[PDB]
Amino acid sequence: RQRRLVLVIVCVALLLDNMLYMVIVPIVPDYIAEDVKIGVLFASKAILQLLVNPLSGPFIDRMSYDVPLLIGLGVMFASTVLFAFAEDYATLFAARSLQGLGSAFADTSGIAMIADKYPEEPERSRALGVALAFISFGSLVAPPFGGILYEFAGKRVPFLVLAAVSLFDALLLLAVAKPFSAPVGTPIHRLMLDPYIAVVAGALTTCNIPLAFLEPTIATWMKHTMAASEWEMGMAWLPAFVPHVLGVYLTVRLAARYPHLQWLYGALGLAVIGASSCIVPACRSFAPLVVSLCGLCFGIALVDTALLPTLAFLVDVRHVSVYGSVYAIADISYSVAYALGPIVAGHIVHSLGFEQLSLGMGLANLLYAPVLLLLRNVGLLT
Numbered sequence: 428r429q430r431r432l433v434l435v436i437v438c439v440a441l442l443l444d445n446m447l448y449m450v451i452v453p454i455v456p457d458y459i460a461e462d463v464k465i466g467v468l469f470a471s472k473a474i475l476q477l478l479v480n481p482l483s484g485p486f487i488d489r490m491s492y493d494v495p496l497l498i499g500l501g502v503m504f505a506s507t508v509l510f511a512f513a514e515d516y517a518t519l520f521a522a523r524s525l526q527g528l529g530s531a532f533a534d535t536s537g538i539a540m541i542a543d544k545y546p547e548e549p550e551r552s553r554a555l556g557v558a559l560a561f562i563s564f565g566s567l568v569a570p571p572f573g574g575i576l577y578e579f580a581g582k583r584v585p586f587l588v589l590a591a592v593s594l595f596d597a598l599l600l601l602a603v604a605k606p607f608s609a610p611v612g613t614p615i616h617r618l619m620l621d622p623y624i625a626v627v628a629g630a631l632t633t634c635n636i637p638l639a640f641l642e643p644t645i646a647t648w649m650k651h652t653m654a655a656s657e658w659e660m661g662m663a664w665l666p667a668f669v670p671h672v673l674g675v676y677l678t679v680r681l682a683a684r685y686p687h688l689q690w691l692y693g694a695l696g697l698a699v700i701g702a703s704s705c706i707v708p709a710c711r712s713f714a715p716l717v718v719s720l721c722g723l724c725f726g727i728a729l730v731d732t733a734l735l736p737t738l739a740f741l742v743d744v745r746h747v748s749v750y751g752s753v754y755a756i757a758d759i760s761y762s763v764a765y766a767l768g769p770i771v772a773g774h775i776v777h778s779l780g781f782e783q784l785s786l787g788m789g790l791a792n793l794l795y796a797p798v799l800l801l802l803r804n805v806g807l808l809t
């Protein structure tokens with residue numbers, strides 16, 4: 428019961444955090460208006476994650492997994508409270524940077540706590556799949572409705588309501604966990620010297636590239652090619668939520684009957700992502716584009732659900748069984764992808780065209796797929 432209650436509290440926090448990172452992208456240009464200046468503002472949450480994760484990683488290994496989560500929740504609450512009262516450039520920049528710092532402190536600690544509370548292989552992937560589903564829901568389904576709510580009630584009251592909800596969740600966590608009631612880990616620099624973790628980091632940073640490079644430069648192409656309407660341009664990623672949860676469930680089911688092929692699922696996911704990315708530019712209608720975007724989210728779910736518990740298993744079987752400096756590496760990879768994306772995607776599209784960036788991303792994803800054969804012999808380690 429205690430494990431189930433704490434998991435729900437952690438999952439709710441991840442749903443609200445990912446919803447806040449997306450609902451502000453369309454709002455910001457209204458209060459600002461030179462296109463380079465706007466790009467740096469958006470790519471500021473991910474930049475601070477690269478500079479803070481190497482420092483907040485080992486800190487989690489030293490003070491368990493409750494205090495960092497509380498600090499992260501407090502920072503995110505403060506960040507939300509300054510967006511409601513923000514109508515300038517510097518204020519929005521500061522709010523986005525605070526969002527990045529809070530994410531860096533609060534995502535790694537939550538994932539590490541989920542990994543630590545479930546030390547058994549059959550029920551670890553099952554617990555991580557729920558968190559992945561919550562993250563995908565918050566990132567995909569909610570911002571469409573937030574955009575509709577903004578045009579009707581403004582941005583002051585909804586952000587205050589979200590901040591109040593986050594504070595209530597933080598208070599619930601503080602009451603349940605009771606952090607104030609009655610080993611030395613492997614250094615992060617030396618952890619990356621393990622050949623079995625560098626390949627996983629490379630796989631994550633390669634798989635997170637299509638979303639980061641396609642989010643800021645897809646609506647313009649859709650408008651210029653299909654003459655899409657506002658509803659078509661807005662409700663594009665919403666029907667992609669069902670394939671993600673289906674893929675997560677399928678991976679969880681398959682990892683319990685054959686508990687040694689955790690590399691095959693990752694390779695298949697990478698190949699599916701590459702094929703979908705290569706197919707995306709060859710769509711001239713709304714439904715084929717929706718299907719091709721559904722395939723990408725289906726592949727991402729497979730890759731994540733296959734490669735997330737593998738890091739915990741490797742740390743258990745080859746290093747000191749402590750987490751927090753290991754998921755910092757995954758956060759660093761995701762952050763570097765999402766920080767490189769929204770500054771150069773538009774320039775690449777302008778200089779080379781939309782039909783070639785997608786081909787390059789698909790080619791990279793396809794080429795990295797056979798690299799995962801190096802994890803073939805894992806599971807025999809003692």
Ligand SMILES: O[C@H]1CCCC[C@@H]1N1CCC(c2ccccc2)CC1
Pocket residue numbers: 559562563566567631635671724727731757758761
């Ligand atoms: O890959 C994971 C690695 C770091 C932790 C979280 C990362 N991941 C980011 C994409 C997210 C997602 C969001 C929207 C649609 C599909 C998938 C799933 C989670």
